[model samples]
Target: QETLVRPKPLLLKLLKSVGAQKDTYTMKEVLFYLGQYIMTKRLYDEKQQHIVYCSNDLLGDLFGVPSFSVKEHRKIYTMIYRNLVVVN
Candidate 1:
């Protein structure tokens, strides 16, 4: 219900691409949506279930890397969420 994060400028676009209309969203919301896009769309690799493929061109838009491992997964989410916090 808080954070008021625009989720940085790029994230705003990502949300919009997925039709997430909130101008401000907390980490929970961000993660939830990411989960939806990744899981709901079956973006992960079939052989390596933990690894992600951006064939739908989704994950690459976020991390700038088409292939996403779970570690990178946490890092990008955490990194973006870190930037989304209010400093002032």
Candidate 2:
């Protein structure tokens, strides 16, 4: 099985502590980075690409203008993923 490695929360926290999320440029950074990840990862397949695009689109539609950026994208993405919604 392949091993999964990711950044630790502490490191992210430290970065945030120093104001990584403060700059206007930092907002959409994650979205752009994630796009590169999806493309290079061969997310060309429908299942994969849709998952990537839909998430980006839905998140964008819900919060950001185009949802192609990192800052607003990340914020709304987290909220949607973490908080459940009910349709009546």
Candidate 3:
């Protein structure tokens, strides 16, 4: 059966590594960095699903990045992946 899989908690670890005290640019910065990493890593197909699932895991109530959601993360992933494809 096809089931969603979660990747290593590298992105969450990276975000936490910034040591931001509450919602701030530090979180945004790491999120952007995470996007870049995802783009450069060329995540697609199953890899993309893994990331999407992992992102959902992080956004539960009382979890990383308050009010964040899988849909939001997927949008960012789509933005980064598409934007980099035709960089001038």
Candidate 4:
């Protein structure tokens, strides 16, 4: 039998620690969790997972910074797996 409910002690610890902090996330951490939530949505096609590309562009526009180049974006994606794997 397989169960989707999983226990993630380290993730729990991280969530608790971060939730207690007053600091807002950096752009790096913002992208980190954005990608994290995005990938999770890819797995299940969840309604809340719908991400509009316009939103990403809007963020870049607001910040007056160009988004990562295609290659750079791929690199960021790869790092997401590397960083998340360590927690598991």
Among these predictions, the greatest lDDT belongs to 1
Candidate 1 local Cα displacement, residue 69, angstroms: 1.7
lDDT of each: 0.69, 0.38, 0.38, 0.36
Q: State residue 23's C-alpha deviation in candidate 1, in Å.
A: 0.8
- TM-score list, all predictions: 0.66, 0.30, 0.28, 0.26
Give the per-residue lDDT digits (tens) of candidate 1, residues 45-72.
7888878887557467667677778766
Error of 3 at 61 (Å): 19
Q: What is the TM-score of candidate 1?
A: 0.66
User: What's the TM for model 4?
Assistant: 0.26
Candidate number that wins on lDDT, 2 or 4: 2
Q: Which candidate's TM-score is highest?
A: 1
lDDT of 2 at 38: 44
- Model 1, C-alpha of 31: deviation from truth (Å): 0.9
State in Å the error of residue 49, model 2: 3.5
Question: How many clashes in candidate 4?
Answer: 0
Residue 35, candidate 2: C-alpha displacement in angstroms: 0.9
Is candidate 3 or 4 superior in lDDT? 3
lDDT of 4: 0.36
